[PDB]
Symmetry: C5
Subunit: 86 residues, 5 copies
């Protein structure tokens, strides 16, 4: 179902994918719209959604869906974007 | 009016820290938070098993908005404001 | 009009650095801040025992708003502006 | 209408990375960017020799505004939005 | 003279200078207004503008000149502020 907050991420380089676009409880229709695939990384008990696109492409698709970036941060070697439906 | 929440990577999974000892008990109860004292700390912390995206959606319904998100060590922190 | 405050992890516990040597003495007194000097520093700093969420709430009452929050090393820093 | 640009420290000197392989060729041309494939990468990147402050000013003239700036590794990244 | 964006920085501690306030192409009048001087770090072939003031002092001076902080970030042991003339 619809969720107003989204978290997306990519590891450096920022210009290339994959971009993580969702967790197990993400909107399946939105994940399908992004062209995302579902997988379970080694050691995780949860599925994650990801796309081969770089984050700029994902951000533009999310903008057309009504999402806006509220914040971006780095942690480890990962860039994370926090978006909100507004 | 201000809230600080956090999770360690992975961002898609909990636990999420949702409060310090002086947090509003009613808001903590609304989030379904548990209270615990980590080893070595003399203060209680409120936490939930939910990932941060779930907590952010619950706080949005309570009038909070994310002002900023940052990384420190291996932790992601969100600063929210009631407005 | 600008303020910089900080705390080291854990974010839920103090001390919180609330000023440099040239900070507004009246605002530092209002926050209940004390002066201290780190061993290798030739300057005084203002600090409170409160965690940063408590300081942020006191600063909102004085007309300050968080514009940005970031991590550096093991420190969380907030940049506030009086609006 | 989002953009991501970056530079490694020092922030006062280029090169500034201004685009990925699928970036708007007109905007890349407006920035005076060159296209190259770094050693070991299968993708092309757009870059300029200018420091990021110069790039930010050029993007401002095309209606872009910085929403966020962050550090990761030894890289500074800016996220801009056409607004 | 028109500087839509500014980048300033200091290394920790944030309560003490020097604060880097410009690159070689910065407006000399704004640099003079801040009381900035030029310096060259050993490894750089370019000069930078700096002040002995901590960043809070610089932010207040820039606020009086029409600048507003849009973002602040840490990278390595440096704090950087991105300001926009608005
Ligand atoms: K990437
Ligand atoms: K987590
Ligand atoms: K602390
Ligand atoms: K650079
Ligand atoms: K400093």
């Amino acid at each position: 179902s619809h969720m107003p907050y989204l978290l997306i991420s990519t590891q450096i380089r920022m210009e290339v994918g994959p971009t993580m676009v969702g967790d197990e409880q993400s909107d399946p229709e939105l994940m399908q719209h992004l062209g995302a695939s579902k997988r379970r990384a080694l050691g995780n008990n949860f599925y994650e959604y990801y796309v081969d696109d770089p984050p700029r492409i994902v951000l533009d698709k999310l903008e057309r869906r009504g999402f806006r970036v509220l914040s971006m941060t780095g942690v480890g070697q990962t860039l994370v974007w926090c978006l909100h439906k507004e």
